[PDB]
Structure 1
Amino acid sequence: PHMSSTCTKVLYFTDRSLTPFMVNIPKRLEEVTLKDFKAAIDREGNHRYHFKAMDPEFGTVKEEIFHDDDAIPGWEGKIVAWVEED
């Protein structure tokens, strides 16, 4: 079963693993929201979400995002995220 090109691949780290997980979002990227990431990683409970971003002032940072509806940062079809127990 084959996927479309409107994939965005996500690497995510978890509290409970040393090795990242890789999953895909069936959205482009300018379309992915915390809602979609949430679903994709399908972990349940209370978590905090931090994402690889570039801020023009601080450089590369892990920027926390909270709201289902917020857009999430990525680059060239890739998202990098960290999940924690909250």
Structure 2
Amino acid sequence: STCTKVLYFTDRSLTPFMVNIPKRLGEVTLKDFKAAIDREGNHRYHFKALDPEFGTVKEEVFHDDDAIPGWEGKIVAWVEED
């Protein structure tokens, strides 16, 4: 529980990918994520998140310094080429 399980989808494959990031769920920022998958160019990023009021939601994050929202102690993401 010192690390975070990351599952992400790419339009480059129909089978998802899974990596583990050193930092803990609350600690992980977009930059950490970007660095984690060694993305080729620049893209759009979405994350399965549990919004308190409106419920489950696919949240997009931009600034590398923003923390990634988790879903059940893990991070679920979609990577769109953009």
Structure 1 residue runs of 4 or more that deviate by more than 3 Å after TM superposition: none
- After TM superposition, the score normalised by the length of structure 2 is 0.91
How far the C-alpha of 1:76 sits from its partner, in A, is 4.5
CA distance in 2 between counterparts of 1:24 and 1:77 reads 12
How far the C-alpha of 1:80 sits from its partner, in A, is 0.3
CA contact (8 A) 2:9 2:16 kept: yes
CA distance in 2 between counterparts of 1:66 and 1:46 reads 11
CA contact (8 A) 1:47 1:85 kept: yes
CA distance in 2 between counterparts of 1:57 and 1:6 reads 28
CA distance in 2 between counterparts of 1:44 and 1:58 reads 34
- After TM superposition, the score normalised by the length of structure 1 is 0.87
How far the C-alpha of 1:49 sits from its partner, in A, is 0.3
Q: 2:3 aligns with which of 1, 7, 18?
A: 7
How far the C-alpha of 1:7 sits from its partner, in A, is 1.1
Query: Who is 1:62 aligned against?
Result: 58
- Secondary structure at the counterpart of residue 18 of structure 1: strand
Residues 77/57 of structure 1: CA separation in 2 closer, same or farther (3 Å cut): closer
The higher radius of gyration belongs to: 1
When structure 1 is superposed on structure 2, of 75-84 and 9-18 the one drifting more is 75-84
How far the C-alpha of 1:56 sits from its partner, in A, is 2.6
- Secondary structure at the counterpart of residue 15 of structure 2: coil
CA contact (8 A) 1:7 1:77 kept: no
- Listed as ranges, the gaps of 5+ residues in structure 1 are none
